Design a protein around this ligand. Sequence first.
Ligand SMILES: [Zn+2]
Ligand SMILES: [Zn+2]
Ligand SMILES: [Zn+2]
Ligand SMILES: [Zn+2]
Ligand SMILES: [Zn+2]
Lengths: 144, 201, 70, 89, 198, 441, 32, 72, 78
Amino acid sequence: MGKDYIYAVTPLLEDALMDRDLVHRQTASAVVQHMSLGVYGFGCEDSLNHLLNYVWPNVFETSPHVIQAVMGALEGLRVAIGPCRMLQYCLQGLFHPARKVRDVYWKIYNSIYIGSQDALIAHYPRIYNDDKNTYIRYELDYIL
Amino acid sequence: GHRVIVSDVQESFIWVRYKRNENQLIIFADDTYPRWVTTASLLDYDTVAGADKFGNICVVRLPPNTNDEVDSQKAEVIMNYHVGETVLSLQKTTLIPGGSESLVYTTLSGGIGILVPFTSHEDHDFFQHVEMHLRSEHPPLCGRDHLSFRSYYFPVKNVIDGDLCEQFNSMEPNKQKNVSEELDRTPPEVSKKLEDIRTRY
Amino acid sequence: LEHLQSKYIGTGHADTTKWEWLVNQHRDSYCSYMGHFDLLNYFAIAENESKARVRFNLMEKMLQPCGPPA
Amino acid sequence: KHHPDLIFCRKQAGVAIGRLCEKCDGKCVICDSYVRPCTLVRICDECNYGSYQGRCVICGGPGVSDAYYCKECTIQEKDRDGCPKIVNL
Amino acid sequence: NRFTVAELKQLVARPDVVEMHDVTAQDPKLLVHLKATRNSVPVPRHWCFKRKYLQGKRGIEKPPFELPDFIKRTGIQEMREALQEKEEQKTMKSKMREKVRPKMGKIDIDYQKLHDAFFKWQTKPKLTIHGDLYYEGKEFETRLKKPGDLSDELRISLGMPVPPPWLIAMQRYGPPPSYPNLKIPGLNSPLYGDVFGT
Amino acid sequence: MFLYNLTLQRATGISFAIHGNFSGTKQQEIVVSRGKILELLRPDPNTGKVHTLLTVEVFGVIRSLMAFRLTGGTKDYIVVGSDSGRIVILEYQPSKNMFEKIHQETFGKSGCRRIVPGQFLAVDPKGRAVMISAIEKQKLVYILNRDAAARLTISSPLEAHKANTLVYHVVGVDVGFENPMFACLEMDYEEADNDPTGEAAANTQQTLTFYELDLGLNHVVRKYSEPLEEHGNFLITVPGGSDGPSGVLICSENYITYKNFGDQPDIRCPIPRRRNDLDDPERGMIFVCSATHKTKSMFFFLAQTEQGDIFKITLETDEDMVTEIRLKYFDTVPVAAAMCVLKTGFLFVASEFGNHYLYQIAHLGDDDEEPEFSSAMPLEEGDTFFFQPRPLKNLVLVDELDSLSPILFCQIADLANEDTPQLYVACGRGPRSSLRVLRHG
Amino acid sequence: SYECKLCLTLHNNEGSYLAHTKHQTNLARRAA
Amino acid sequence: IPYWLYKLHGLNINYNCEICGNYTYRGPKAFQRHFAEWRHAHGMRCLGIPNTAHFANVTQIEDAVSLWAKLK
Amino acid sequence: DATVYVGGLDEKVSEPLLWELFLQAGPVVNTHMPKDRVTGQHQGYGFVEFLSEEDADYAIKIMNMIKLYGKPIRVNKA
RNA sequence: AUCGCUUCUCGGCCUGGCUAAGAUCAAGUGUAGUAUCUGUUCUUAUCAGUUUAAUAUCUGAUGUCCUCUCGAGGAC
Ligand SMILES: [Zn+2]
Ligand SMILES: [Zn+2]
Ligand SMILES: [Zn+2]
Ligand SMILES: [Zn+2]
Ligand SMILES: [Zn+2]
């Protein structure tokens, strides 16, 4: 029943996520998680993606409570919006040069792949064949 | 007219301004959702339909106040659903004589379905309440959720499946009485509403 | 974390190779094409091949995804 | 309301039915909520068999009521993750 | 062991997507190929900073909140601030006196106005794009105000009707050298509202 | 926009089908999964036409479908392996004309994941246990026992997961009244991933791994592991006990090898090719569709060749070892993805393209004009008995259920003079193709 | 929250800022 | 001037840019800020390429063979 | 001569109004607009350090004819 | 008109009784983890090992031959 009020609470959560204190970001991450799990399957993915545009910069936090809230918000956003946008967010950082940044991105991608192992095949990026092995599948190019 | 929307392997729909008089080709609109669209049925000038390789029907409209002579602009997905089979073709034309001018899509598995746009908000709310009652009253035989099955590839958005509405009329009489008490109506009135929705075409 | 979470299909780590991730993606794509009836019908009835012949070709292509490793 | 320790079993679930004591009654076994108890709890193995018959799938008191998953954990279907009985390691 | 930025720029089709430290990655070509797609997002800037994310402000002041239009149209803020100012002047003797003897009917307006503001007066807000990433700024450079177009305040201040006085010198001087790709409509590319150029 | 999508023309292409005594009576029931909806039919063999008794939409993708009957039960319960992680065993109720779920046990996550079990499903021949295995590295088997009210009491399955072990096909062997066992076509994948030169990929081969379910010991152990030279594209089980020997048969490109539990003759019978076939010899002929039909005393098998002709092979077990298999082309049928040989003169073959064929098997299977190739018959390992294309002599086709799958293109218009507009869909595969115009009244 | 702009230091309590009176060296550093 | 800023700011390693007079500027912030400057903008103008995003990554004189006047 | 002194303005024309006029005309890298410790008001004249000397030359030559907040804005080389 | 004194008008500038001081009082945890005070902090030379996206950290010598009395001169 929250879909009438998602657009009302969107700028409040947007102002809360930009706060200096980690408590506001953690509790707003819990807000995004419960709001994403609440009205899943109702077409409110634009405001959820807009909130994810503020949540996903906060993945570099080191405190355990706020990073647990960030992981729960990422799980709720991957349930609600879909694994395609999470794969789009993680594809440019899974092969990051930094060890810690690519480790955190690999943790998020491993959680997304545990949750969405079946649906990630159709949302896999279109990469051509290289010198190591063939990559472009010809079964998807078949038309009947 | 003055625009061509092409379905690629990665992008579901890319709209290029067909300036044949100016002899210039500029891509007016792009897309962010990756889909191997194998069908096209434009409901409007800015609306493009796509049938992905994983059997997902996605109708995406362009953003309003978009410049025709520009680029790097995305189109929001107005509706997205999973039909349960690989959709081959789609045409925005009335498949029945009179009634509703819906869009008819034929799948590669032998299925054909019409997506009737509900122009009544009260009827859409009654259908949504009946679907929410039937998703808990009658579980699926496979064990998967109806919302999970209808949104396997991408999440669903403003799409109502008529299979659950047809299966609601095929339920037991105690379950139909419980569903009518949850919907605050009669089971014969719900059957008449489903018959009117079927005859709307 | 969990041991079975790292031991799950499609899992990885911070030192996961690109060829290993591509091979896992190709094996998951082959398993999804084998599991789905509509995807196997779309990738099978386009050519002049049987359904079980396409299933055997996909089973060979699953091992062929581990064909040229590095 | 959680702790970073206490991984549960990560075992394949069976026909045994979970059981909750009154001190932590009504809680979700995963996310510790109180909203919409939807799916019953399966406790896999010898967590039920033996001296731990009808005990708590949480702290360890004498269980009185059937444990449940909430609807929010079964939105992502975390109920198939395995046995939720706490093993203190 | 690793090639330079010139080999990565020659190998990849997008040399602008190559980072400064992308050559020291284990797969620089794969990272450049992944970064060159249409739906990618960059790394947030805090991985290079020693400062934590949104932490080093420490001395600035901000406005508290801006409520949406329907909530202020219900007008809860007026008697809420009146009740807060009335409670601030109360004593704790009066506070427990009101605690044991309550007084209701304070606001008591209706249910229909909030029902209309939730449903009839419900307005969709402004949401940013999927690829947007908020950072330490991202609240000041709102011009993306097109270049080559004067602002409405500068047009009203110089008496420009909607003919600026310096638009004739701008047309006679050609395009500016600071923004050669910017096209000014009406004088160089023959412009709705204050944005008379791009 | 708010769209209430409704399907008008249902998909009829059956990807898989099973048959048996699922109706609870003497009438034969065949359940075919035509996509998102499974239809169970109990048509009269005297009339010969195929009529669907019931159809239920499950709203999911089924990766494996099977049926099983208990000890002495007149009803064959259907165990459905779908994309969801809950394996569902259901019993059809003919009074309500619908299937009621007896049990539904959750195993893992939903969807068609690689490690998610449900890709391969099998049951014990004695009605003892049901095994669900994944495409790779996951397998389980739950013991099915009768309750006090003759209810299917499910049990907790035992873990049978091994690292990098893909499965091609699996079947539960007939162990009689002893502990049940199941054979699988295992293939190693660890050495192919570890070796970068690709030599271990060529060195790898399919192996028949038979694991015995120790029900008394409450454990699962791999009994036998025989490596096979030919890669197993299919696997069938010979009817053990009184209908013949207890063993398996693996088919490949013009090579069918039968092996029993222990020392048996590996009769590598070549496939009976057509008499001067116009197809190229590079494409190997394999038993794509296999149907083992057991009579009251004897048993036989039906296989599909490369041309699509149904070939009947007798079971010359002779109580010692697999000696002969008289592979003669019994009839010429269309391109069927799966064929089932029921009793009481019924034979259903589900066409992958075009109309599925429900034939009436009036003869005993010996009414074929094609030549017969035997496994005990020696050859020069280059040709077999040239089975020419005979007509429908052993089984006469009595029902042609028209299916539009696969579909290529369609167009609906009111160009013709009728009460409803005509929808002409051009579709089909190979030469088996047509434009079907559909109109109502 | 209390903030010392001459020190650029946040304070949890009022007595934390009341004890922030180092501040002379920070004021001499921020004077130029 | 302090030295902890000189340590934890990258100023301890001085980076040279060849096109702006081969100038060796302290810190990688200055070298990554050369791609929008005054004299080094004159340097890439003297290379013969317009100041684009693809010119925002080049730090060598030879890279003008892969400039905007290479493909169309 | 990248820095240009921009004057001939009033209290309505500020540093952000000059930045908007720069984004219209020609880009300035930095802004120097000091104020008094007693009044604290914009004088209308500030040092706009441009990213190029040609931008400051076009500001001094072509863009020194506007009426910033009622007064004629003049840009000189600095 | 300048100067000093006196007086008045107007403009910013110090300005609440008595009694026994009238009397009396004033209580929370524990485990993790985070944030902020306060203190200690950071100029010797290139190169190499380790480390790092890169810095930082990190272990080792900091112009040679002869002579005179850390200094100077000589084919160097
Ligand atoms: Zn308890
Ligand atoms: Zn929960
Ligand atoms: Zn357990
Ligand atoms: Zn201070
Ligand atoms: Zn430079």
